[PDB]
Amino acid sequence: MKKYRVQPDGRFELKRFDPDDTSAFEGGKQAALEALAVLNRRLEKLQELLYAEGQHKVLVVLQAMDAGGKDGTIRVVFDGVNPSGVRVASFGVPTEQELARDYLWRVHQQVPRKGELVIFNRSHYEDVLVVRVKNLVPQQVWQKRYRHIREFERMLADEGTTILKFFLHISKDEQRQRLQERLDNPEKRWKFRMGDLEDRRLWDRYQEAYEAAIRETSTEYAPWYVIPANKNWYRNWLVSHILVETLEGLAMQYPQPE
Amino acid sequence: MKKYRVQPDGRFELKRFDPDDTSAFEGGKQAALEALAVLNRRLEKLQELLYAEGQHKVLVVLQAMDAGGKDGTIRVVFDGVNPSGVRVASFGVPTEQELARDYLWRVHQQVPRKGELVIFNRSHYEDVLVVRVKNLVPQQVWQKRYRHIREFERMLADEGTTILKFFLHISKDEQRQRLQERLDNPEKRWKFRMGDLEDRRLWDRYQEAYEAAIRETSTEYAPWYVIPANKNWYRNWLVSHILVETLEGLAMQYPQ
Amino acid sequence: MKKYRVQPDGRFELKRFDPDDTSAFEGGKQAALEALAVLNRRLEKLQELLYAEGQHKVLVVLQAMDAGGKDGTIRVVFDGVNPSGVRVASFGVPTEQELARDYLWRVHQQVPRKGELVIFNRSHYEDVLVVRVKNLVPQQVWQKRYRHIREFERMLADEGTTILKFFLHISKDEQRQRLQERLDNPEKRWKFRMGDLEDRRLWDRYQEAYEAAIRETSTEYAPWYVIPANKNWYRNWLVSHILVETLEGLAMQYPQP
Amino acid sequence: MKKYRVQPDGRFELKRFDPDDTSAFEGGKQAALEALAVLNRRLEKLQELLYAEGQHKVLVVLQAMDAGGKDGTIRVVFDGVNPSGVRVASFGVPTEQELARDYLWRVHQQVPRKGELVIFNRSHYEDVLVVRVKNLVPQQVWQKRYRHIREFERMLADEGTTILKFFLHISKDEQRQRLQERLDNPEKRWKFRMGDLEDRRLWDRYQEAYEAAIRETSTEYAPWYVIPANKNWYRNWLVSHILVETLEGLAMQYPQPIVIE
Ligand SMILES: Nc1ncnc2c1ncn2[C@@H]1O[C@H](COP(=O)(O)OP(=O)(O)O)[C@@H](O)[C@H]1O
Ligand SMILES: Nc1ncnc2c1ncn2[C@@H]1O[C@H](COP(=O)(O)OP(=O)(O)O)[C@@H](O)[C@H]1O
Ligand SMILES: Nc1ncnc2c1ncn2[C@@H]1O[C@H](COP(=O)(O)OP(=O)(O)O)[C@@H](O)[C@H]1O
Ligand SMILES: Nc1ncnc2c1ncn2[C@@H]1O[C@H](COP(=O)(O)OP(=O)(O)O)[C@@H](O)[C@H]1O
Ligand SMILES: [Mg+2]
Ligand SMILES: [Mg+2]
Ligand SMILES: [Mg+2]
Ligand SMILES: [Mg+2]
């Protein structure tokens, strides 16, 4: 089941992962939806424990190509989970205030507190992704940032944060369909930006960047999971299974005051 | 259904509201749960519109006595609503940093942005509630805050925030049972502090403080709704109905 | 010198104030520099006592036209005052994050804490100034802001903030010279933006905007002082005098051992 | 100077530094005050350039024992420097909100922005000092924190922050006098807390904690300077000299960009 966990050997190659792979589930969509429903209930209970224990901090990082399933994952995986204990932090185009400080400043501000589960919809990884691909800074600058991230995450983990980093892996062809579906969708007509067409020619450069990022930052304290995300049902089930298992591993207990 | 909206006539009496009242729903639990399921789906859709339109700011304020149903309301009313568009801000015991600035500073920081629905689990109201009851500041101070709160909410509303204030009204006897269940439940035991028994002795002063605040701060731009909260099913349905109707009233539309 | 405090009668008139007026000081520059040196020393001591007492919050609001002397006031008036107790908060062009919430959100965040003296270099007033002049929101919206401002400042004052609002009043002709002097000084040329010229075309609308804000928001708890700011030496001495006297009035005492 | 810069060799021994040392200055009190006046003027001009250029991020970290001269340094070194470009961030006893996140969260929030000079009056170092001495977390937990700091400061420096860390070194005897003077002074008594006598009792444990911290975190990108701080005049001149020289080294330039009618 950890066939998707990227080992900290620095020997990662994205070619080994197929976006269309569904080998960890034996049953197809209908069966998987039932399985997800079970895990969602366990997740709801596990969050209730987390909030009650108030010791651990859970950080779920979502990274994907545009239309890679970031919003869809949050919406389906965290369906019915208490709003008081779960929070989404999105990282968009940096403001002048954000650029006036190091790139980790805006990110560090949003980290989960004790008893809180935080989802990062894009993250500090963007500073080794869009920044690298579009050469917003030279290689000399962004190359050093891998060490920064390893060390920043070491600090977070050592101080009590459970870090789960999910790479939602979709094919170039799947993305083409999803963006075309976005353009014909009336309630998604607004989600489209013109820049989505320029980043499309940069596909390979983005894939190279994801390969580099994952190889350099997947550690035992902060592992990367490559989720085959072409099938939404499989993506949702697998992300739920990984999170539920990790949270189960924490052996969280309800406190007693006497 | 707006028999629960507190009119801005400064003539409200809490006396007139029974925590055990269920008169706005023509039936019981089983039927009300079905009704809530329908409103929850509408709520999910209305939030989706809010986030997409990205113009309005929605502020839901929850105030209640301890074990009055604040966590329960958030959990049930907002079940299945997109986490990206909904946020809870809890107000606890003020820190030294928080006390070093005016009481509205910590609260103003958490207000909803455009396209966001924020729930305040306890609020700036505590500064005319626990503060008043325990005399954490003298009367001279906390008396002036009613005007502050009216004017701060006028500003929020004028600048595009839809404000819904819910008072979850439970009986002294219901609280006694709920707190006893907290002591008799291992998965509830944790929410308990010894101070929950002390505040119990201050019941009437807290009730007097709630009546006072609601009378002073329920306005046309920021109304107070007194929710009979003894029955969870009725509490959840009624808060959902009021929220859904208010959000419907905004005539929100998806962008072109 | 109470001749500069704008009474809360709602009958303020900016034509009654001359930027070139120096009548409150019985002398010129050389004598005023000496007088300012005395007040600056008292200000340094008063700040030490504010920080020590740790109860009051002091908010100094500076509003002026471009090249009206806001930065020079900070630099000279607060010279030698302990950095640990004094802070500047500047308000610029609002970000999308700042615009996504009410206009008072970014301003409320910067308010002085207990024992702190804060200077606002531009403020929440901007939201009834540049916003009004350039119609960034309609009249329907910015008209209601005067009440918001009065009530927000009432709340700050009631809760322990001493509020001093200074309008640094310069003439249209003085601004023309200063802006020209900016374009000629290499260590100042960087402060120049093309907008400084576009806003100069809007002089009168800005003046009308200042008369309206001052008339509407000068209260007992938060007064406005119209400082004739054409002469730097007079501007610096008069703001120092007003601040020092206000701080003296607080009769601040050292904590009980 | 490089005699006070702590080399990144991990062989630092605080015993090699005398709080009463004044060897870098030839002239005594009167001559040093004149020298400081000159450096203060250069500092004022250098800050004006920093704010105008708006590219560099400057972080001055002040660490000292109680009554070690932190407030005194800020007050004298930064005298007359424009408030708009200089900010003090003090770190006291953590709040429940601050404790609910990692210890670097509150500190990272206060880092200088572009064109700003920030002074940290106590810092993230407190989390390997008072925390270590009073065992507010176990050794297993605070031991890992040296690497965190090295790496956090590497990130800050790599991304554009000039980091100056000053350890204001006073003797046990000097502290005893200053604490007593605070007590007898009516305009200083207010600074006193009962814990000042507890942080006096643990002197050696604190000194051992400063030795370990400085030894572990003085790097090329973020050096530690041990300032002999028994003499205020020498302390003030030396911190001013180090800061001015560092700022001079940045070779800051004013930006480059019509008849007004
Ligand atoms: N560090 C960064 N530097 C530059 N651009 C960034 C950075 N972080 C995020 N971005 C960009 O910001 C954009 C956010 O777009 P937005 O529409 O707000 O979100 P979404 O990914 O849901 O479409 C992304 O296209 C992303 O590449
Ligand atoms: N302004 C305030 N001043 C003093 N106490 C406050 C203030 N606001 C909130 N509190 C108190 O903080 C406490 C928060 O308690 P906590 O257990 O964290 O939440 P809950 O109400 O869910 O039990 C409440 O008992 C409340 O009375
Ligand atoms: N509320 C506001 N809305 C719009 N513009 C604003 C607002 N507050 C400030 N501004 C503008 O931001 C600009 C800040 O410019 P800047 O160069 O950073 O400062 P300075 O006034 O020292 O030149 C001013 O020209 C001012 O008109
Ligand atoms: N990380 C921390 N953990 C515990 N105590 C801390 C921490 N950071 C700072 N402190 C303590 O906070 C206190 C600062 O408060 P105060 O007496 O008002 O000022 P000062 O440092 O000027 O003496 C110091 O005693 C210091 O040890
Ligand atoms: Mg509780
Ligand atoms: Mg409680
Ligand atoms: Mg300027
Ligand atoms: Mg002290």
- Chain B residues within an 8 Å CB radius of D97: 95, 97
- Chain C residues within an 8 Å CB radius of A96: 95
What are the residue ranges of helices labelled H in chain A?
Answer: 28-53, 70-77, 96-99, 105-108, 130-133, 139-158, 172-184, 203-217, 232-249
C and D: number of Cβ contacts within 8 A: 73
Cβ < 6 Å from ligand 3: which residues? Answer: C 91-94, 122, 126-127, 130-131
- Chain C residues within an 8 Å CB radius of D256: 189-190
Closest CA to A70 of A59, A82, A61: A61
Closest listed ligand to the CA of D63: 4
Q: Which two tokens stand for residue B51?
A: 């986030």
Please write down the long-range contacts of B132-140, taking CB distance under 8 Å and 24 or more positions apart. Answer: B132/B209, B132/B212, B133/B202, B133/B205, B133/B206, B133/B209, B134/B202
The DSSP output letter for C5 is: B
CA gyration radius, chain B: 18
Strands B86-90 and B57-64, by their bridges, are: unpaired
Resolution (A): 2.5
A90 touches chain B (CB under 8 A): yes
Q: What is the C-alpha to C-alpha distance for residues A149 and A168, in angstroms, rounded to an integer?
A: 19
- Domain span holding position D1: 1-261
**A155 closest CB neighbour out of D100, D114, D148:** D148
Q: Phi-psi category of C115—alpha, beta or left, where left has phi over 0 and alpha has psi -120 to 50?
A: left
Q: Which two tokens stand for residue C255?
A: 């904590």
Cβ neighbours of residue C68 closer than 8 Å, sequence gap 6 or more: C168, C169, C170, C175, C229
Distance from residue D167's CA to the centre of ligand 4 (Å): 16
Closest CA to C196 of C179, C213, C171: C179
Q: Do the beta carbons of residue D130 and residue A127 sit within 8 Å? A: no
Instruction: Give the residue, out of C98, C107, C122, C206, with the most ligand 3 atoms within 8 A of its beta carbon, to mutate for a pocket test.
Output: C122
Residue B60 main-chain phi, psi, to 5 deg = -105, 120
Q: Do the beta carbons of residue B243 and residue B117 sit within 8 Å? A: no
> What's CA B228's distance to the chain center, in Å?
12
Q: Do the beta carbons of residue D91 and residue D150 sit within 8 Å? A: no
Amino acid at D37: A
Task: Note whether B80 contacts A80, CB cutoff 8 Å.
Answer: yes
CATH number of the domain that residue D89 is part of: 3.40.50.300
Distance from residue B40's CA to the centre of ligand 7 (Å): 52
Amino acid at D198: E
Q: Which two tokens stand for residue B252?
A: 């929100």
Min Cα distance C73 → chain D (Å) is 10
CA dihedral C105, C109, C114, C120 (to 10 degrees): -90
Closest CA to C156 of B95, B108, B98, B105: B105
Q: What is the C-alpha to C-alpha distance for residues D155 and A103, in angstroms, rounded to an integer?
A: 9
Q: Which two tokens stand for residue A77?
A: 């995986």
Closest listed ligand to the CA of B194: 6
Task: Note whether B97 contacts D95, CB cutoff 8 Å.
Answer: yes
The DSSP output letter for A195 is: G
Residue found by looking up tokens 């009004």 in the block: C132
List the chains bordering chain A where 3 or more Cβ pairs fall under 8 Å. B, C, D
Min Cα distance C91 → chain B (Å) is 17
Considering only CA atoms, which residue is closest to atom 14 of ligand 1? A92
Ligand 4 closest atom vs CA D131: 3
To 5 degrees, how large is the angle CA A200–CA A205–CA A209? 120
Closest listed ligand to the CA of D127: 4
D138 touches chain C (CB under 8 A): no
Question: Would you list the DSSP string of C147-175?
Answer: HHHHHHHHHHHHTTEEEEEEEEE--HHHH
Query: What is the H or E stretch that residue C119 is in?
Result: strand C117-121
Distance from residue B149's CA to the centre of ligand 2 (Å): 18
Q: With the C-alpha atoms ordered C147, C150, C153, C158, is the resulting torsion angle positive or negative?
A: negative
Q: What is the C-alpha to C-alpha distance for residues B8 and A247, in angstroms, rounded to an integer?
A: 49
Q: What is the C-alpha to C-alpha distance for residues D215 and D11, in angstroms, rounded to an integer?
A: 7
Termini Cα distance of chain C: 38
Residue found by looking up tokens 């709602």 in the block: C10
Number of domains into which chain A is organized? 1
D249 touches chain C (CB under 8 A): no
> 3-state SS string over chain D?
CCCCECCCCCCCCHHHCCCCCCCCCCCHHHHHHHHHHHHHHHHHHHHHHHHHHCCCEEEEEEEECCCCCHHHHHHHHCCCCCCCCEEEEECCCCCHHHHCCCCHHHHHCCCCCCCCEEEEECCHHHHHCHHHHCCCCCHHHHHHHHHHHHHHHHHHHHCCEEEEEEEEECCHHHHHHHHHHHHHCCCCHHHCCHHHHHHHHCHHHHHHHHHHHHHHHCCCCCCEEEEECCCHHHHHHHHHHHHHHHHHCCCCCCCCCCCCC
